[PDB]
Amino acid sequence: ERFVVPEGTKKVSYDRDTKIINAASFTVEREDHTIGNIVRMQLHRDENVLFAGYQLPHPLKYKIIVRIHTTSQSSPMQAYNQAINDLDKELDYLKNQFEAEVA
Amino acid sequence: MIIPVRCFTCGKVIGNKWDQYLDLLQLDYTEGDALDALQLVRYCCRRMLMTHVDLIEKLLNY
Amino acid sequence: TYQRFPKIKIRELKDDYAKFELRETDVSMANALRRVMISEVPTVAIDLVEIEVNSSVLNDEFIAHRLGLIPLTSERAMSMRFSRDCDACDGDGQCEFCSVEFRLSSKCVTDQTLDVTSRDLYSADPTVTPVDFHKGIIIVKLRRGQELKLRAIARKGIGKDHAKWSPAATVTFMYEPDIIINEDMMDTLSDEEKIDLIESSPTKVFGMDPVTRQVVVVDPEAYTYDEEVIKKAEAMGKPGLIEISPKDDSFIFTVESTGAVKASQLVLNAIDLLKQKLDAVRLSDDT
Amino acid sequence: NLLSLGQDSLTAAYLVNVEKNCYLNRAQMQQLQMYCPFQLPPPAIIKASPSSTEPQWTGMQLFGMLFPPGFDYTYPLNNVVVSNGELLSFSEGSAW
Amino acid sequence: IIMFEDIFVVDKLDPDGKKFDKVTRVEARSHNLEMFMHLDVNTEVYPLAVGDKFTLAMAPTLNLDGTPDTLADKYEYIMHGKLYKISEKAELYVSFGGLLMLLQGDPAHISHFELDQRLFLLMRKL
Ligand SMILES: [Zn+2]
């Protein structure tokens, strides 16, 4: 029941922050600390990113809120996608290394 | 109550080790040596194999 | 700003036990890999049990619960579809994709007590045969008579719910500490104090070399991060005698499987599932 | 006041205001800033060692993100001074 | 850009413990200016022993010729704080994130310090 994403609800929603420029909040539905922690740690590697963090306010409500603040050089969505792509490439490299080590 | 399986704390299968544990206890083996012979390095599995009480025998007899 | 380049070195590899070292990566990646391999890797296990004869002293629900915990070979877990996702059938008996049928029938016609193990559990698909380790997992013990006949169905599931679809068994990782010795304050210490310092360590992390009459670092991976030697050195009056700090970019992984899948295959499946999760989380650009 | 901090809250506040020897880096400070309503203060600790980068935040500044900027507090017994919503000083006592 | 610069020698340590795992308030007396200083320094991270000599500097900004709010390479114990009390032999009370500093000297030595201003703390042990 909890595994299935709610019907009619998108996994990731984009909401811009009016008070702070170049600030946005990403609400990831049906996510846990696994994705949030690695995304937060990957975002810190980017130089343009200023604020990177995630929170899980309600354990019962399986949602993850990710807040990204960047300089006047890249959009928060661009940094988010870049971090996801870098993490995917790292996973590919780790899989290749493990496959080589097994053989 | 038969020996519990899957070692509630750890998750390791211990269902098929009760007969071996009893056989080791039949010989001149202490509880620690018997548990070590079964390759149980975590004390949760050792507790599960040591704190179990065989109650199914009384259920079958009575 | 870009991706990392982790390095993997395998120390020991077996069917159910794997120990490898992961380097040049953050703690978050290792923790996420551990969590995925302990709670996200799917396996096949019995969830629905139908019985007709239950003359055994044990209750029906107890038998069903202890049947659901039996480890089964899960080589097809990745390819199989979920029961809720399977739309070809509503779910009854054997299915070509989701459900696997199991039949058990035990009748005791002898004075000796009959033990219903996991070996006498037959399935239509040979690939879903329960893992054999021995005498097998004892299900029910039967006296004279007391027949037990049941029909069971096994479905693919995630280890997050009911904690019975988890193939991993306490997968761990450490930071692989590095030991630093001043080697100058040791000369001031007497022979008696060196022995006491050696005995202070809970595990065999430091050794005494008889030829050089000085302490050496042996097996640095078994430190367990217990501040016993540091406290002993501070008590003896030497504050900076031994400095031990964890290494943030080095890790040593220990993966123990339950027999459902191979440990290397478990790691590969965890990596694939993490990649799929990242792909699903990925958000398309909007203009 | 009818409502107090509570056991865990009081103990955590005492620990974060008494130790003063544990510093929080940028990642942990930003992670904790999610629950705090107010913005992050300056690190106030640029360099602690000749070869230590990554300027850190002190524990007392973490507790300072719980007061409005216009709020001003003074507790002479515990030597607590809050100016512009920032906890300037504290010695001991935990009576405040 | 440096307002106050002087050489200090530590007189005593209030905790005076090597492994107390606590902030240690240092007492240093200035040379050629006769100024007394209280400063909370983490001894475990930055070791200071009685009798050591260190230079101390205070600048409103770390940038060169303006840009208030690159001297980082020269020093090794940079701190940031504000001056909240100038009441006196005038003395200054600057808190670096809860770490109190008490610089007591002469009225003429310290006169260009304003109230409620942000100032840095540069310290190098020679
Ligand atoms: Zn265990």
Ligand SMILES: [Zn+2]
């Ligand atoms: Zn089906």
